[PDB]
């Protein structure tokens, strides 16, 4: 039936407290509501992840550390560095409970898909793909994407994770590196010095999972048309080789023109074409957010993509709502690319695509 939208006021307020994206969850929800898109979705309150759920991926020692520093927001605990807390991942007061709420929200979305409540379930505050079993990383404390995939494994036999965030989805890839039940596909900036430093085209997984990880390394300045060409070519091959039964799709908006990271040069329309390609498979699909550090642009992007999921054309004028002034001075939904070079050469992209095709022959 209609898509599930994971939401409650309390959940949004928790998500608004994440250190690197304050208020973003409220801006995203507010804009979706301003376009009245929530009236076309089934709103489902998220459940909080239990300790037992979190521990099916994360280690007890890491969960215990996170819970300890979370209680009073001890951002000066001497053991935080072993567990990845520090600059990227501060010990914000309450972060254990906020992260458990986000993990629970993604698990709730997955359960809705299993129950056949919907074909698409959305958690725009999820997508924290860098967290490791025993380590916070990259603004991620608990890996809600992994938790969602592990929930989907109850029913859906083969699962495709597609990560369109600017950064390599390394924590998800690592979690499933040794298995062939989950294929991971990440398109990301790959350049030495650029976080997290992994995900070359030669990274294909390990052991029994060899060839069940796909990485598409891309350079600065990519725009909508070339990005979609790459994404469609890879997903066509993956779909035919792997025959997934469910998809988890991470749509971090840090690729979008105007992001302070200033790396890719995408608009929501290009990402929307990738999303449409996946939706036409008509599989259970769990939609996640992720990065995105121009907050108004991230809200523009995810609102537009919610419209794509609903098959609706949205008005270009930003409607009046709580954060209307954040969209000035032009107050439009569309984003214009920057005037900078695309550093992706056609011969290199072709070689990457050919290398991936050769890998997928083994699948």
């Amino acid at each position: 039936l209609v898509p599930v939208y994971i939401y409650s006021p309390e959940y949004v307020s928790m998500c608004d407290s994440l250190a690197k994206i304050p208020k973003r969850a409220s801006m995203v929800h507010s804009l979706i509501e301003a376009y009245a898109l929530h009236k076309q979705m089934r709103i489902v309150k998220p459940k909080v992840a239990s300790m037992e759920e979190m521990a099916t991926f994360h280690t007890d020692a890491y969960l215990q550390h996170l819970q300890k520093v979370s209680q009073e927001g001890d951002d000066d605990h001497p053991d935080s560095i072993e567990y990845g807390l520090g600059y990227d991942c501060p010990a914000t007061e309450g972060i254990f409970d906020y992260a458990a709420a986000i993990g629970g929200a993604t698990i709730t979305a997955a359960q809705c898909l299993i129950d056949g409540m919907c074909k698409v379930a959305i958690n725009w505050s999820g997508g924290w793909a860098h967290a490791k079993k025993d380590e916070a990383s990259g603004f991620c404390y608990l890996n809600d994407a992994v938790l969602g995939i592990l929930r989907l494994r109850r029913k859906f036999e083969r699962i495709l994770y597609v990560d369109l965030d600017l950064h390599h989805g390394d924590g998800v890839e690592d979690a499933f590196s040794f298995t062939s039940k989950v294929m991971t596909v990440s398109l990301h900036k790959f350049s030495p010095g650029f976080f997290p430093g992994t995900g070359d085209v030669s990274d294909v997984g390990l052991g029994k999972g060899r060839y069940y990880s796909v990485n598409v390394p891309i350079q600065d300045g990519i725009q909508d048309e070339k990005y979609y060409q790459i994404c469609e070519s890879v997903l066509k091959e993956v779909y035919q080789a792997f025959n997934p039964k469910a998809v988890v799709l991470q749509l971090g908006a840090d690729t979008i023109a105007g992001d302070p990271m200033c790396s890719f040069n995408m608009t929501p329309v290009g990402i929307g074409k990738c999303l449409k390609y996946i939706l036409q498979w008509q599989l259970a699909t769990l939609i996640l957010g992720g990065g995105g550090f121009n907050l108004a642009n991230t809200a523009r992007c995810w609102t537009y993509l919610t419209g794509v999921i609903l098959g609706k054309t949205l008005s270009s004028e930003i409607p009046d709502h709580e954060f209307f002034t954040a969209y000035g001075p032009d107050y439009v939904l569309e984003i214009t690319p920057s005037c900078r070079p695309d550093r992706n050469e056609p011969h290199r992209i072709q070689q990457i695509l050919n290398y991936i095709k050769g890998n997928l022959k083994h699948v």
């Binding site: 600059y87 990227d88 860098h130 990383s137 990259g138 603004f139 950064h167 010095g193 976080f195 997290p196």
Partner: peptide, 5 residues
């Protein structure tokens, strides 16, 4: 380990 951020 890299810094993100």
């Amino acid at each position: 380990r890299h810094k993100k951020x």
